Curated annotation (Swiss-Prot), chains A, B:
Shown part of the complete sequence: 3266 to 3564 of 4405
Name of the protein this chain belongs to: 3C-like proteinase nsp5
Impact upon substituting residue 88 to R: In strain: Beta/B.1.351
Origin species: Severe acute respiratory syndrome coronavirus 2 (2019-nCoV)
Reported effect, residue 47 to A: Does not affect ability to cleave and inactivate human TRMT1
Residue ranges of every copy of the Peptidase C30 domain listed in the record: 1-299
Task performed by this protein: Cleaves the C-terminus of replicase polyprotein at 11 sites. Recognizes substrates containing the core sequence [ILMVF]-Q-|-[SGACN]. Cleaves and inactivates human TRMT1, preventing tRNA guanine(26)-dimethylation of tRNAs. May cleave human NLRP1 in lung epithelial cells, thereby activating the NLRP1 inflammasome pathway. May cleave human GSDMD, triggering alternative GSDME-mediated epithelial cell death upon activation of the NLRP1 inflammasome, which may enhance the release interleukins 1B, 6, 16 and 18. Also able to bind an ADP-ribose-1''-phosphate (ADRP).
């Protein structure tokens, strides 16, 4: 098992650079609109405690430099939606894919196209942690890089990168400009909430093991969901939601192992450990493969 | 710090489907030639023990169906170069990138674009191992997927996927059709040579751990190159050369940790184990990052 990103071509053709004075970052060009973090309108002095409403009134269309490669896209309108800037440009992107804007739940994975100065650099899979941060790999100049999933040629954009936290994890918004988690777009020290293990994904990893014939940890017990959630919290595992139980449906049907029976097996592993035994050739439980990721790799 | 692949868009526009009878796999369309594994000309009976020159002489151009998306390309010529079939087509691929064909050395990494029926499915980083296998993520229908590196807009193709060995590792050729390793393109069980660990890559990754703030494995011991290499060989690690030491120069400069001091750290890890601790979230010693991979992602 390894982390597999979606092919990035449909997103590469949408990346542009957006510059305001000397502040520069990445934006996303879809039809005739460029979406980017509103942080671009900040001078160095504004980044600590920006007054975004005040900073925008000073700005006119001709203050925004938008470039696809070295080709300038003239801005003909600008607005602010939550923490994203929307720049209307005079050219509709001929490479615009079929796309949606989605807001993802914690545990869900997505592909990140890391970009610098509008130029795509690399692609990798990330998971949204339950404290609404991601353990990404980002350098300076990456602000505005996006995260996405692809279903049947349709790109669902779910993340726009804004900042690095002191602990080295990363925080950002959806493509409507709403932050994931309790963060704000200022250059101030903000702490990630305490992280938890992503229970739904650990359960998917256990189903993956079963599919590949590694099933020693299957015990003879069952549990209720309420009983399991209360126990899981004592081991810094996330409580399961009703949506979590349902996205485990396909793996449960494939293996014939009821979701609640697998929760009982996981509860046993938490209360007693693994005793030098491995699962999928590993002594650590993996929590960054979703049920969908598992089916992608197994079938 | 993460395993990061190159953006795949320049390769996506070159993937097509090749079909001969009921046998089908992926091909690479560059200018007016489609490159694909010659295994495509085998029926299920042929696959077990194929005489390829005999099989190819009995084929005509119209025995080859090539589809790019929904568009059918007409084959107007064919030839075989080692294990690679070259189909001349009546249309040049307008999305052909600047490209080269290169044969890589063990320890070097590349990006894989996994494809099924000519449609790209995922992208991830792999390394050529010392026994000329790769630990990929490939399912049925992935034959003909390619591996590549991207250097300022030029795609250097280095791998064409052929088969999965009974241990689950993968084997393939360069784009001139020569296998990496002692394998042949026939459906028979094939084992690889002993899998020696890429020592210079493990050292690069330990330097990545330091650069990313993890230092528990460092120590005050010292070692000579030969004394380290004695322990390395004992543990089936590749001997470290002065060229490897030189290549690690920039990382030792950045961290102030001498290369032979990092060797002392690795020697203890090999002799004592990790004591349940982890490095960069991994419970085992990672050997699929090159010094350049670490430099590029950390800077
Ligand atoms: C190491 N790292 C990992 N992720 C990041 C993301 N990131 C970023 O790329 N840039 C940021 N500040 C800027 C500085 C600029 C200097 N010039 C010339 N232009 C610049 C543009 C930007 Cl955006 N930041 C900091 C940051 C960005 C925000 F959007 C925000 F709301 C708060 C912040 F503190 C940053 O985190 N760097
Ligand atoms: C599980 N896995 C991981 N990697 C692979 C790659 N792979 C593959 O995709 N296909 C193969 N055999 C074929 C069967 C076909 C059935 N039809 C209808 N069409 C087919 C086309 C192919 Cl290529 N193989 C096996 C294989 C492929 C070779 F190129 C070879 F030289 C020897 C082999 F044993 C395969 O490994 N599968």
């Amino acid at each position: 098992f390894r982390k597999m990103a979606f092919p990035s071509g449909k997103v590469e053709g949408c990346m542009v650079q957006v510059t305001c004075g000397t502040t520069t970052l990445n934006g996303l060009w879809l039809d005739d609109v460029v979406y980017c973090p509103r942080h671009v309108i900040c001078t160095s002095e504004d980044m600590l405690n920006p007054n975004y409403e005040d900073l925008l009134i000073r700005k006119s269309n001709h203050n925004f430099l938008v470039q696809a490669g070295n080709v300038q896209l003239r801005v003909i309108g600008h607005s602010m939606q939550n923490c994203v800037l929307k720049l209307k440009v005079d050219t509709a992107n001929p490479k615009t894919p079929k796309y949606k804007f989605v807001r993802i739940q914690p545990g869900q994975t997505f592909s990140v196209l890391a970009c610098y100065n509008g130029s795509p650099s690399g692609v990798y899979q990330c998971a949204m942690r339950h404290n609404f941060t991601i353990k990404g790999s980002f350098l300076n100049g990456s602000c505005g890089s996006v995260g996405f999933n692809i279903d049947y040629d349709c790109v669902s954009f779910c993340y726009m990168h804004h900042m690095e936290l002191p602990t080295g994890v990363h925080a950002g918004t959806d493509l409507e400009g709403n932050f994931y988690g309790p963060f704000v777009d200022r250059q101030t020290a903000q702490a990630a909430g305490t992280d938890t293990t992503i229970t739904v994904n650990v359960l998917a990893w256990l189903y993956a093991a079963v599919i590949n014939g590694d099933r020693w940890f299957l015990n003879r017990f069952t549990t209720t969901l309420n009983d399991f959630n209360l126990v899981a919290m004592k081991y810094n595992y996330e409580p399961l939601t009703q949506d979590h139980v349902d996205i485990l449906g396909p793996l449960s049907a494939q293996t014939g192992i009821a979701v609640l029976d697998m929760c009982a097996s996981l509860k046993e592993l938490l209360q007693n450990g693994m005793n030098g035994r491995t699962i999928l050739g590993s002594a650590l439980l993996e929590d960054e493969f979703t049920p969908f990721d598992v089916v992608r790799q197994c079938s």
